[PDB]
Amino acid sequence: SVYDAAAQLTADVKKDLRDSWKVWGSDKKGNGVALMTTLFADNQETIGYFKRLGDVSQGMANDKLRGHSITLMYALQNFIDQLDNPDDLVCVVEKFAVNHITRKISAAEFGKINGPIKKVLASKNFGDKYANAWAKLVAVVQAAL
């Protein structure tokens, strides 16, 4: 249930998401690409899905990857901005869920992003507490896949 999953985003969780986003979302290009490179580096079996972007190993030097990465951070920005209204959060989550269903990405594989998120956040001094919060948000998308 995408709606029950959305209900998991309590006041304490929303705060942790906002607090960490103040830092993580401040450098969308830089952090977006780092998130993607981490995903590819630690989950090589997901690289094939990103064929359109060309050679993702080039990281920041890859223009299509950079564009994809920046845009991904705006999807998260979108989510953050919908935390006040469950209905709006759900409709945008569904929109992106469709994008991933077309790419044949399951709830389980979408969840492979949690490891990379925990890692990049940890590098910015935002521990398991924050990783767990972001996992709850990722779980809303998972519920829609």
For ligand HEM, the binding residues (CB under 6 A) are 39, 46, 49-50, 52, 68, 71-72, 75-76, 96, 99-100, 103, 105, 109-110, 112-113, 138
Q: Does 78 bind a second copy (CB under 8 A)?
A: yes
Does the annotation place 100 within a ligand binding site? yes
For 10, which DSSP code? -
Q: Tokens in use for 136?
A: 């709850």
Q: Which residue is nearest to ligand HEM (CB)?
A: 52
User: How far lies 36's CA from each of 17, 23, 41, in Å?
Assistant: 19, 17, 8
Q: Does 92 bind a second copy (CB under 8 A)?
A: yes
SS3 78: helix
Contact 125, 20 (CB under 8 A): no
List helix spans (H) across 62-127: 63-81, 86-102, 107-110, 114-122
Binding mask 23-52 for a second copy (x = CB under 8 A): -----xx----------------------x
Q: Tokens in use for 41?
A: 């580096």
Q: Is 44 exposed, middle or buried (0-12, 13-18, 19+ CB in 10 A)?
A: exposed
Q: Does 74 bind a second copy (CB under 8 A)?
A: yes
- Contacted entry of a second copy, ligand HEM, none for residue 144, CB cut-off 5 to 8 Å set by kind: none
Stretch that binds a second copy, among 7-15, 41-49, 77-85, 120-128 (CB under 8 A): 77-85
Provide the annotated binding site for heme b: 100
Give the footprint of a second copy on this chain (CB under 8 A). Answer: 28-29, 52, 63-64, 66-68, 70-71, 74-75, 77-78, 81-82, 87-88, 90-96, 98
